[model samples]
Target: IETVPVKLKPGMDGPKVKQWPLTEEKIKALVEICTEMEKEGKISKIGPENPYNTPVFAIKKKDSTKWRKLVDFRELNKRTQDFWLGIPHPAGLKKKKSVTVLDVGDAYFSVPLDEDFRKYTAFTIPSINNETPGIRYQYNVLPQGWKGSPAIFQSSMTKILEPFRKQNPDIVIYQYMDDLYVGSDLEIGQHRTKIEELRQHLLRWGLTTPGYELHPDKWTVQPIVLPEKDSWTVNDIQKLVGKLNWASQIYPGIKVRQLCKLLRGTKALTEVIPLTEEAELELAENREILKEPVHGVYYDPSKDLIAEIQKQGQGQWTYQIYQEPFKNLKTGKYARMRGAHTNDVKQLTEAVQKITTESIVIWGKTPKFKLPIQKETWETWWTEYWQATWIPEWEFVNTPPLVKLWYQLEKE
Candidate 1:
């Protein structure tokens, strides 16, 4: 594994803010965490002479009795050189397969930092009393929140897993930083063997050199699942939407728009809101969708593309474009794509005709002929309406040019 180095952008060599006030409880937690980290050789005490020091703070962990220690490198990161690397996404995972999800514990810290760049990650935890000066410390390992850490770590892991991937092309491996999903077409036995092989490879790499350790308790094999509650906070609803979105991508059916509409009603992040009777019903339906395994839509470009358009009441022009196979796979079902409506027949015709290949089949109300109103008669009615209720100057002044031309013809 390559030792991570911090390279600052040109002309960023000054020290960052030294102190950010923390409560006594936070300070105590920070002390405890830092002391253990110091013993583990992850961080070391540094003199105040270091020119670049960032603030250190603690944030409470959700549903836990611990505080997460962090270095505030926001100021320093502005000047820090960063890398953008390709990270694996969940979309790459196969739909139906035996799978194992592995999460590496403290992934970033596993990689050792370059000795010269240690001073740049300097941080200070202020003392409780004014008796002694606050102590300064620097990370010997890669600290979290560094701009380039994810890309750098991902690059290293990609290199590490290259050989394994090449050897076992059958096993579908999706790695996103610390999280890895190993998949196989076969049953549990075959998938278990592959995971064991990976485990040994990881162990050997660690025994000889610096490496990461998988979270013992976080491993999940095969099936996956979710939450329990009658009412939910806005934050929890968003979280539910996010997970459902991921699942819906992998497996079809389950219109998440209903859940999204629920979020649109409130903007508060953590305020607990009671679930509506309709929302409860929607949740029940979504649960059923998850329980059943449904095949997803397969895309094939060779077949004829069909642009299906359905005009709903008045101005709603909903469309869906899919291949010929769409009907064979999912007949009588289509996801609607909405387009802004216009009253002009030509504009609407042009918009629809623009997308379709050779033919256009529109399913909507038939065009009905109506008696055309004379320019003089229309003006008399508009004048009477205007007299009763005054119209805005902008709207009253911006009459169509065609109407003006019709008036001129009538005058002639």
Candidate 2:
């Protein structure tokens, strides 16, 4: 109860998103995670009377041996309301010399949820080998991917740290959501004192799980920037970008927009969009932006900002009811929410036979076009659609799954 337990935003359901088929290895990893959570009191087994059931999937990182198990909370989040603040851009701290960085373990899960709200957090876990058709148990902590989790966690984090920060004015602290970093340009005593103060506050906030500690000199304040390791029948590009999208909100360079736009209106999530040489340049550029230093200053909670954004979020829930839509700046077109439930790539295309387009429904001929097609009029549009929908200039390496590494639940 760091701040408040999650309450469904009304009209939300125990909805579930589609999950990819799991391998035996993935299943074992997933079960191990849930068992650990169950042991930790974060989740529990439930009976036949469960109200909601979400689906779970396992994601494997490129250089990692463990898998990240995720629950699809679309149904719950759609109904629940979200609160947001204008995330402050990183002010490159000129005075930041010595850095001590800490990455939280199971960030959102670190905060406990009220008992009543656990109903909406229940997901179908594996009874057999994995995080599949098992019992539906609610999570006692905030589960990631829910729309409201970030805003709630961010506000909670700032609330927990501001007091300690105020007490230790000599120390400078910066947080990009859960990646808490603090540094000082003062003498060794002051710098070391800052780390001790920051660590104590983070532990007070329950971020203590022996996560990670980085001591870098002149630490320029870095945020985790994970790259996709695969581009096959992937449904996770938007998922990874979903993290990036949220991270950008916390940091800067919302310009990572282009990388995500490539998948817009893609017929199937698995429809191949291999990372090519041209695409690498955009990613490289985005990488550089992440590497850019911030000056200083962020995180002063205001009653007015919360009231305003909460009001807007409330409006979105009430007004934009159908399926939330966002504008794609690159294509200048409207599309449904990017992180819609997706399937593994090639699961439909060549995870079978020769794929073929069965129809030739030209532009202006579809019902919404409200117009007719002429050969002369449609020539250019047809060529553009058939040729290079989102082809990149070149690709040096194959990017793997689109999910970023936040953490693993099993102890090493």
- Among these predicted structures, which one has the highest TM-score? 2
Provide the clash count, candidate 1. Answer: 0
Clashing pairs in 1: none
Q: Candidate 2, TM-score vs. the true structure?
A: 0.41
Q: Candidate 1 — which residues are off by over 4 angstroms?
A: 1-6, 13-15, 23-25, 55-68, 72-75, 84-91, 94-111, 129-132, 150-156, 167-204, 207-412
Question: What C-alpha lDDT do the candidate models reach, one value each?
Answer: 0.53, 0.45
Q: Per-residue CA lDDT of candidate 1, range 137-172, in tens?
A: 898877776645655677667767778889887776
Those runs of model 2 whose alpha carbons end farther than 4 Å from true positions after fitting are: 1-6, 48-51, 58-68, 72-79, 84-101, 105-110, 126-132, 145-147, 150-156, 167-197, 204-206, 209-412
**What's each prediction's clash count?**
0, 24
Tens digits of per-residue lDDT for model 2, 218-253 = 222223455546553336666556665654543465
lDDT of 2 at 5: 52
Alpha carbon lDDT at 317, candidate 1: 34
